[PDB]
Design an enzyme around this catalytic site. Structure first.
Site, PDB file in Angstrom:
ATOM      1  N   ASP A   5       0.833  -1.232   0.000  1.00 10.07           N
ATOM      2  CA  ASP A   5       0.000   0.000   0.000  1.00 10.07           C
ATOM      3  C   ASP A   5       0.863   1.276   0.000  1.00 10.07           C
ATOM      4  O   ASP A   5       0.534   2.253   0.649  1.00 10.07           O
ATOM      5  CB  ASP A   5      -0.977  -0.007   1.208  1.00 10.07           C
TER       6      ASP A   5
ATOM      7  N   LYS B  15       2.008   4.669  -1.082  1.00 13.32           N
ATOM      8  CA  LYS B  15       1.499   5.858  -1.793  1.00 13.32           C
ATOM      9  C   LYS B  15       1.740   7.031  -0.849  1.00 13.32           C
ATOM     10  O   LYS B  15       2.010   6.808   0.341  1.00 13.32           O
ATOM     11  CB  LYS B  15       0.012   5.708  -2.106  1.00 13.32           C
TER      12      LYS B  15
ATOM     13  N   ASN C   7       0.586   7.230   2.726  1.00 13.21           N
ATOM     14  CA  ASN C   7       1.205   6.262   3.661  1.00 13.21           C
ATOM     15  C   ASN C   7       2.693   6.509   3.966  1.00 13.21           C
ATOM     16  O   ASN C   7       3.434   5.613   4.421  1.00 13.21           O
ATOM     17  CB  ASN C   7       0.963   4.826   3.158  1.00 13.21           C
TER      18      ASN C   7
ATOM     19  N   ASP D 268       1.078   2.428   7.818  1.00 11.79           N
ATOM     20  CA  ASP D 268      -0.055   1.674   7.286  1.00 11.79           C
ATOM     21  C   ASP D 268       0.326   0.292   6.727  1.00 11.79           C
ATOM     22  O   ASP D 268       0.519   0.102   5.507  1.00 11.79           O
ATOM     23  CB  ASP D 268      -0.838   2.469   6.245  1.00 11.79           C
TER      24      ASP D 268
ATOM     25  N   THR E 132      -5.002   0.950  -3.806  1.00 10.78           N
ATOM     26  CA  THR E 132      -5.547   2.086  -4.529  1.00 10.78           C
ATOM     27  C   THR E 132      -5.163   2.014  -5.994  1.00 10.78           C
ATOM     28  O   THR E 132      -3.964   1.957  -6.284  1.00 10.78           O
ATOM     29  CB  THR E 132      -4.966   3.371  -3.886  1.00 10.78           C
TER      30      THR E 132
HETATM   31  N1  LIG Z   1       1.732   6.543  13.325  1.00  7.19           N
HETATM   32  C1  LIG Z   1       1.011   7.602  12.855  1.00  7.19           C
HETATM   33  N2  LIG Z   1       1.272   8.883  13.119  1.00  7.19           N
HETATM   34  C2  LIG Z   1       0.545   9.910  12.615  1.00  7.19           C
HETATM   35  N3  LIG Z   1      -0.499   9.717  11.795  1.00  7.19           N
HETATM   36  C3  LIG Z   1      -0.872   8.478  11.447  1.00  7.19           C
HETATM   37  C4  LIG Z   1      -0.109   7.326  11.959  1.00  7.19           C
HETATM   38  N4  LIG Z   1      -0.653   6.226  11.502  1.00  7.19           N
HETATM   39  C5  LIG Z   1      -1.680   6.632  10.707  1.00  7.19           C
HETATM   40  N5  LIG Z   1      -1.809   7.979  10.681  1.00  7.19           N
HETATM   41  C6  LIG Z   1      -2.844   8.762   9.933  1.00  7.19           C
HETATM   42  O1  LIG Z   1      -4.043   7.987   9.897  1.00  7.19           O
HETATM   43  C7  LIG Z   1      -4.438   7.649   8.558  1.00  7.19           C
HETATM   44  C8  LIG Z   1      -5.058   6.258   8.595  1.00  7.19           C
HETATM   45  O2  LIG Z   1      -4.210   5.233   9.168  1.00  7.19           O
HETATM   46  P1  LIG Z   1      -3.793   3.954   8.273  1.00  7.19           P
HETATM   47  O3  LIG Z   1      -2.742   3.210   9.075  1.00  7.19           O
HETATM   48  O4  LIG Z   1      -3.289   4.575   6.987  1.00  7.19           O
HETATM   49  O5  LIG Z   1      -5.109   3.061   8.220  1.00  7.19           O
HETATM   50  P2  LIG Z   1      -6.005   2.370   7.032  1.00  7.19           P
HETATM   51  O6  LIG Z   1      -5.331   2.455   5.662  1.00  7.19           O
HETATM   52  O7  LIG Z   1      -6.364   1.013   7.578  1.00  7.19           O
HETATM   53  O8  LIG Z   1      -7.162   3.315   7.152  1.00  7.19           O
HETATM   54  C9  LIG Z   1      -3.134   7.834   7.766  1.00  7.19           C
HETATM   55  O9  LIG Z   1      -3.279   8.023   6.346  1.00  7.19           O
HETATM   56  C10 LIG Z   1      -2.460   8.990   8.471  1.00  7.19           C
HETATM   57  O10 LIG Z   1      -3.023  10.255   8.035  1.00  7.19           O
HETATM   58 MG   LIG Z   2      -3.908   4.150   4.945  1.00  2.20          MG
END
Ligand SMILES: Nc1ncnc2c1ncn2[C@@H]1O[C@H](COP(=O)(O)OP(=O)(O)O)[C@@H](O)[C@H]1O
Ligand SMILES: [Mg+2]
Length: 280
Positions: A138, A140, A143, A160, A179
């Protein structure tokens, strides 16, 4: 396996929301016993076997196992895991400088040097992961988070791990799809997938970094997917006329249909430019 089932609110105070996903929400938090700040990712669990809301326990356990293995400056780390009947809660390393996606929005296009300063960190993180036979699946700009967006040379972390898999046999065949703009043709065609799928995504990310434009993006998800399978992209003169031919060469060697002929993470690091959900 099972996670800590104490109320997470007994141990942490939550603050601002950092991000939102299909069945995940990420919130800033502060551990009571240390005063250290983290990102808490609340993942909604499946309520029944057959359900399509929530994430299967198998998938959550895979994300947690992978996170537990990783320790590298360019990847996120996992601090603790909690759970209750509705969610799994991952306490992740906080990355406080926002998404590379939003940084790019606030910049419109980078120079080759700014692009390569981000790219070398991403490649280092991916080298670490691939060394560990972990395909991210994933990659992009949303992420890829910055530690601090207001320094001239921001440090990055890959986040992510929701689609990441161990690749034990050099390929896996368990139906993964991210995506459309960033997925490799083998994903689009439902073929066995391996580490090379990440290398294609890197090519797409590089193109965007340099031009501010997405190389395969069509008007609908299906059209993007068609563009990807056909390797329907080109370097628009309006964007790339003053971009080096070596930058284009790096991209051309990644955006290759056959994964066997695509550059590996080790090749990308030695390349002369560098070397010192699918449905509408
Ligand atoms: N460790 C982190 N620190 C800061 N922001 C985060 C972090 N992990 C995720 N995010 C924010 O949260 C969003 C969603 O988390 P993600 O791990 O990408 O979950 P999923 O793809 O399952 O929704 C990210 O795109 C980012 O904006
Ligand atoms: Mg994500």
């Amino acid at each position: 396996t099972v996670f800590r089932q104490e109320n997470v609110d007994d141990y942490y105070d939550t603050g601002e929301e950092l991000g939102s996903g299909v069945f995940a929400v990420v919130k800033k938090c502060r551990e009571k016993s240390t005063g250290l700040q983290y990102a808490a990712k609340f993942i909604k669990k499946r309520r029944t076997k057959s359900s399509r809301r929530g994430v299967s326990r198998e998938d959550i356990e895979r994300e947690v196992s992978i996170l537990k293995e990783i320790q590298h400056p360019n990847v996120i780390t996992l601090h603790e895991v909690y759970e209750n009947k509705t969610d799994v809660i991952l306490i992740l390393e906080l990355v406080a400088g926002g998404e590379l996606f939003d940084f790019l929005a606030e910049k419109e296009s980078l120079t080759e040097e700014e692009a390569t300063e981000f790219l070398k960190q991403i490649l280092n993180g991916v080298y670490y992961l691939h060394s560990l036979q972990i395909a991210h699946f994933d990659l992009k700009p949303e992420n890829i988070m910055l530690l601090d967006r207001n320094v001239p040379k921001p440090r990055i972390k890959i986040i992510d791990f929701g689609l990441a898999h161990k690749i034990d046999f050099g390929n896996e065949f368990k139906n993964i799809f991210g995506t459309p703009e960033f997925v490799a043709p083998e994903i689009v065609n439902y073929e066995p997938l391996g580490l090379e799928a990440d290398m294609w995504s890197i090519g797409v990310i590089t193109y965007i970094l340099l031009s501010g434009a997405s190389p395969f993006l069509g008007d609908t998800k299906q059209e993007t997917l068609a563009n990807v399978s056909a390797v329907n992209y080109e370097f628009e003169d309006e964007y790339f006329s003053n971009t080096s031919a070596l930058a284009k060469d790096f991209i051309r060697r990644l955006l290759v249909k056959d994964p066997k002929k695509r550059m590996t993470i080790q090749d990308s690091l030695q390349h002369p430019w560098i070397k010192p959900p699918q449905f509408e």
